[PDB]
Amino acid sequence: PVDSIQAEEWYFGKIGRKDAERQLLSPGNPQGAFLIRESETTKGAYSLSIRDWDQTRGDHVKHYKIRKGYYITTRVQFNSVQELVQHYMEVNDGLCNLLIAPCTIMKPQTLGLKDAWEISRSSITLERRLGTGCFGDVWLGTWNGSTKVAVKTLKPGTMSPKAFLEEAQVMKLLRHDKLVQLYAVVSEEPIYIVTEFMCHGSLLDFLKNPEGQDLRLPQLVDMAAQVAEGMAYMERMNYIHRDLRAANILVGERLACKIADFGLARLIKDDEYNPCQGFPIKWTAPEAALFGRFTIKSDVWSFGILLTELITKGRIPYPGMNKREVLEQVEQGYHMPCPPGCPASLYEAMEQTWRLDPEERPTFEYLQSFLEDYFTSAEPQYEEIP
Ligand SMILES: CCN1CCN(Cc2ccc(NC(=O)c3ccc(C)c(Oc4ncnc5cc(OC)c(OC)cc45)c3)cc2C(F)(F)F)CC1
16 A cells, blocks of 8 residues: 555564664664564564664664554553654654664665666676686675675676576565675676675584584574575565575674575576476485475475574584485485484474475475574463453
């Protein structure tokens, strides 16, 4: 609609508490940036998250509870949430700060010419080569000197411009805060694919670094919920990853995980990505490795293997078994035991993602909701009187 609350700039739907903090503390957001999100109690309850500043906490986010007219304090109540937001945007009446502007993830401005992603190569400056490959490099660079970006380049003569840019075409359609955001392209040789920059790089490297080794259990589960949130989006868009693994997850600031993929030249058919044509054995579901049945349910098997990498901080799956032993044992019903330090409840979700019947595996919508509400315990049974 046009008057509904969902159409407002500051309404962010049903995003996690940690996700609201990460987007509010992202660059470009002033002190007093806010958003309205749905809480965990019910669907009719809301929460207000504001970007504040203390000299002890630094730049942090304060969260207020909106319940039911709608109100934050019992003194002042309103008809709708939009009137509550309008009031606290005009009068700092008890809040930690006056509501200034809605939360915006500041993506840079392109040329605006109709390929809205085309930019002049003068605006991109390559700084450091992050990786090399048969078809091109991955660079760390800057766009207009300020914002840091990552650029995928195309080595001439190794790949057609259309087959290389097909990755950019797919990334235009897949737009989500838990997927790598495409920023811009340069369609003349040498071809550029400019995206957001995830400063910590691969999740597998991040887990094996000194910072990742000191990660607690609630932090690992939050990163797992983000990966499931990203795949739940691909589930809604009828896309599949085919290569879901910890090495294909990029980690940014405040443990912000995003879905990524590398080496897409094996999946090119007719300037399109066909997943069923010829993979990592220990991550692909057994029905995909033997019969080529690549579906979103095979990515759920991959996500279960990814959970073992997270809960063990980067351990190889199926230790001591070669690539041939795993495929024979998996078809005999074998899967990995409960990893060291993994709770029983989480290992139950892993076993569900490893059921040999792909249609009996959980959906990513359930996995996201499970991992997001993994530490929020159940409310006690109380009899509601009419
Ligand atoms: C059926 C097949 N299906 C089809 C759909 N397909 C979805 C798909 C397709 C293509 C991409 N594109 C990328 O992933 C990507 C794009 C550009 C760059 C520069 C990039 O690399 C880095 N980007 C950002 N920061 C980096 C930081 C680094 O270190 C500091 C680093 O080190 C080298 C690399 C960094 C990664 C993402 C997805 C997604 F799954 F996400 F939706 C999945 C498979």
